[PDB]
Amino acid sequence: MILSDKDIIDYVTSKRIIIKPFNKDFVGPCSYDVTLGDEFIIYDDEVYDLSKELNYKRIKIKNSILVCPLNYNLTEEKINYFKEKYNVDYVVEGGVLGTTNEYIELPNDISAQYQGRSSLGRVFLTSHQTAGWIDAGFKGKITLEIVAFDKPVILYKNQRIGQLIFSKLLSPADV
Amino acid sequence: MILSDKDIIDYVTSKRIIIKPFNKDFVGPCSYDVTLGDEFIIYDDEVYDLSKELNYKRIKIKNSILVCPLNYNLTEEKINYFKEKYNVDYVVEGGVLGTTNEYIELPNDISAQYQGRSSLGRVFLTSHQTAGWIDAGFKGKITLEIVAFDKPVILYKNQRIGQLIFSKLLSPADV
Amino acid sequence: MILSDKDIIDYVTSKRIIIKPFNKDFVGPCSYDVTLGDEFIIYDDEVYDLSKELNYKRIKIKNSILVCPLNYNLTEEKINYFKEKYNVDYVVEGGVLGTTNEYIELPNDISAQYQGRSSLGRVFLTSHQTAGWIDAGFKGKITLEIVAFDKPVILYKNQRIGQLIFSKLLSPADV
Numbered sequence: 189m190i191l192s193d194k195d196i197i198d199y200v201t202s203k204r205i206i207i208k209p210f211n212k213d214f215v216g217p218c219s220y221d222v223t224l225g226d227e228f229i230i231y232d233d234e235v236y237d238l239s240k241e242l243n244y245k246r247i248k249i250k251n252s253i254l255v256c257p258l259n260y261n262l263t264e265e266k267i268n269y270f271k272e273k274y275n276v277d278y279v280v281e282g283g284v285l286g287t288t289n290e291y292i293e294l295p296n297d298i299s300a301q302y303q304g305r306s307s308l309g310r311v312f313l314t315s316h317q318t319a320g321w322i323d324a325g326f327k328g329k330i331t332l333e334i335v336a337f338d339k340p341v342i343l344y345k346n347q348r349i350g351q352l353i354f355s356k357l358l359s360p361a362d363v
Numbered sequence: 364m365i366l367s368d369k370d371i372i373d374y375v376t377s378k379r380i381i382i383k384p385f386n387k388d389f390v391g392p393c394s395y396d397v398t399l400g401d402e403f404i405i406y407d408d409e410v411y412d413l414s415k416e417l418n419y420k421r422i423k424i425k426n427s428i429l430v431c432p433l434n435y436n437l438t439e440e441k442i443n444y445f446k447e448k449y450n451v452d453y454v455v456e457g458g459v460l461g462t463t464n465e466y467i468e469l470p471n472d473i474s475a476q477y478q479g480r481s482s483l484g485r486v487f488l489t490s491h492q493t494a495g496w497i498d499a500g501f502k503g504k505i506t507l508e509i510v511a512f513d514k515p516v517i518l519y520k521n522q523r524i525g526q527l528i529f530s531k532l533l534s535p536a537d538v
Numbered sequence: 539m540i541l542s543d544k545d546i547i548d549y550v551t552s553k554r555i556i557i558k559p560f561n562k563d564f565v566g567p568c569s570y571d572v573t574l575g576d577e578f579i580i581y582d583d584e585v586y587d588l589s590k591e592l593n594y595k596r597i598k599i600k601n602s603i604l605v606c607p608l609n610y611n612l613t614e615e616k617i618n619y620f621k622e623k624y625n626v627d628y629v630v631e632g633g634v635l636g637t638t639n640e641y642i643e644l645p646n647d648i649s650a651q652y653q654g655r656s657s658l659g660r661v662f663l664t665s666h667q668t669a670g671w672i673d674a675g676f677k678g679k680i681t682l683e684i685v686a687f688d689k690p691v692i693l694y695k696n697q698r699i700g701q702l703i704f705s706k707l708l709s710p711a712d713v
Contacts, residue, residue, distance in 0.1 A: 189530070189533040190474050190530050190531070190532050190533060191532075192499070192532045192533060192534040192535060192536040192537075216498060217471075217474075217498045217500055217536035217537065218474045218496075218498060218499050218536055219496065231661070231688070231689065233689075234689065234690075235620075235624060235689055235690040235691065235692065236662075236663070236688075236689055236690065236692065237624065237692045238691075238692070239692075239694075242661075254410065257434075258607055258687065258688065259434060259607075259609060282662075282687070282689075283662040283687055283688035285660060296567075299540050299568045299703075301494060303493050303494035303495070304492070304494075305493070307413055308413070309491065309493040310492075310506060310508055311406070311413065311417075312411075312457075312492055312508060312510060313411070313492070314493065316493075316494070317654070317658075317659035317660075317662055317663070317687065318653050318654045318656055318659040318664065319494055319651060319652075319653035319654075319666070319670055320494055320653070321568075321569065321651075321653055321701075321703050323567045323569070324567040324568050331660060333659045333660055333662060335687050335688070337433065337458055337492065337510050338411075338433065338457045338458035339408075339409065339410055339411055339457075339458075340409075340410040340411065341410065341411040341412075341413075342411065342412045342414075344414075353474075353496050355540050356533060356539050356540070357539060357540050357541075357542045358539040358540060358541050358542060358545050358706060359541075359542040361542040361543050361544075361567035361568055362542075362543055362567065363567065364706050364707060364708040365705050365706070365707050365708060366707075367674070367707045367708060367709040367711040367712075368711050368712055369712065391673060392649075392673045392674040392675055392713065393649045393674050393707055393711055394673070429585065432608055432609075445585075449587065476669060476671075477669075478668050478669035478670070478671055479667070479669075481668055481681075483667075483668075484668040484683045485635060485667075485681060486586040486588065486592075487586075487632075487633040487667055487683060488667070489668065491668075491669070512608065512632070512633055512685050513586075513608065513632045513633035513685070514585055514586055514632075514633075515585040517585065517586065517589075519589075526671075528649075528671050531708060
């Protein structure tokens with residue numbers, strides 16, 4: 189069973205589900221809206237080999253980022269053009285990792301699923317490459333896997349980026 | 364808990380869940396198949412900035428559409444080649460928005476998830492860029508976020524495009 | 539309600555859910571990890587028309603495969619370069635189908651959802667193009683829909699590739 193608005197409020201009130209920061213206006217009928225952080229990771233190795241430690245750079249934006257589809261031919265002139273035209277701080281192509289602002293802790297009897305916002309899916313911007321279920325017992329911010337699939341998309345710091353849907357477990361998990 | 368076939372039938376019968384049109388043959392073990400509409404939206408601005416109103420054109424197909432991956436080099440000659448070879452009415456690359464034929468209304472105690480058809484996922488055609496949970500209380504057709512990720516894919520008007528999975532809420536939502 | 543670890547163990551023990559092979563170490567708090575098979579399918583027609591029978595070749599790898607994003611300009615020299623540098627047996631671009639090692643059977647009162655591993659989603663490698671719910675009553679291995687969206691990704695035979703999440707149905711399905 190999926191937690192309704194009033195269940196989300198109860199679970200947050202009693203600290204069964206931790207959400208930091210929490211804004212009651214982000215509680216929907218059966219979900220909780222989460223927001224986009226200002227820190228991003230971009231990988232800079234040639235290939236991804238998960239048997240090795242991955243090299244990355246960390247980027248922090250002031251206000252906004254333009255996320256371009258893979259293979260956009262981003263010359264330095266094209267980047268300046270986008271920065272001046274759309275007032276973005278950073279222009280990237282292909283995948284970038286972001287984070288929610290929100291830190292969560294899930295109890296042993298709840299699993300949550302992260303879903304990107306449908307307004308963004310309608311412009312072919314994704315913030316998750318998987319279905320996004322999160323283990324009972326999880327503690328952390330949510331790592332966002334961001335890719336644009338059609339045209340460049342402007343993302344703003346602190347914008348609503350996605351939602352958490354909470355489900356009851358049938359029985360409590362071991363941790 | 365996910366509604367089984369017999370639950371879907373009960374909820375449709377009593378008008379708890381509205382599905383228009385409804386075909387009982389589309390009820391699966393624990394889902395309801397939905398179908399592809401003939402109307403599509405294609406964006407025609409340079410970038411997607413959701414702080415602004417988005418400019419789009421609306422396309423209506425007679426029978427079928429060829430959806431090509433982004434950056435397919437669609438010359439006007441290549442388009443004619445595809446139209447004559449595969450008998451499609453329209454050829455597009457990158458993202459296009461479609462719709463289900465089906466209009467739904469969800470009660471305060473059900474959330475539904477849209478999932479694209481696995482026969483289509485196996486040819487790398489997606490009709491949703493997000494996990495696809497739909498709020499309790501939702502009324503509307505489902506907007507499809509269509510992208511091909513490998514080779515062009517022919518889609519046919521009225522074909523089964525995806526499924527709705529219905530879940531009980533733990534408690535009724537406020538609207 | 540989602541099955542916890544102890545529920546997964548009960549259901550496997552009594553043969554309500556069949557998982558072959560089964561490794562108890564793959565049981566998580568509320569999911570079961572599945573692994574990557576050594577057999578892949580690659581399509582070799584020009585377009586995907588699901589009204590026709592699809593032509594494919596079958597590839598079997600010894601150890602590992604490099605999955606490159608669509609439109610990677612894989613010359614035969616670039617392929618040799620990747621094979622020698624990263625010790626992979628096969629180099630592919632765009633979509634490829636794989637399979638889990640695990641064969642499952644679901645009873646009439648459970649639906650399962652396949653989700654790709656988050657370590658892989660964080661490198662923009664997907665193994666499912668849909669939300670991945672599987673019918674109550676399903677029997678089979680899980681077909682993986684594999685695409686890389688940023689840079690090439692090495693996948694290893696038998697690696698953990700994704701997870702199954704099991705949910706109770708509200709009522710038993712008819713088959």
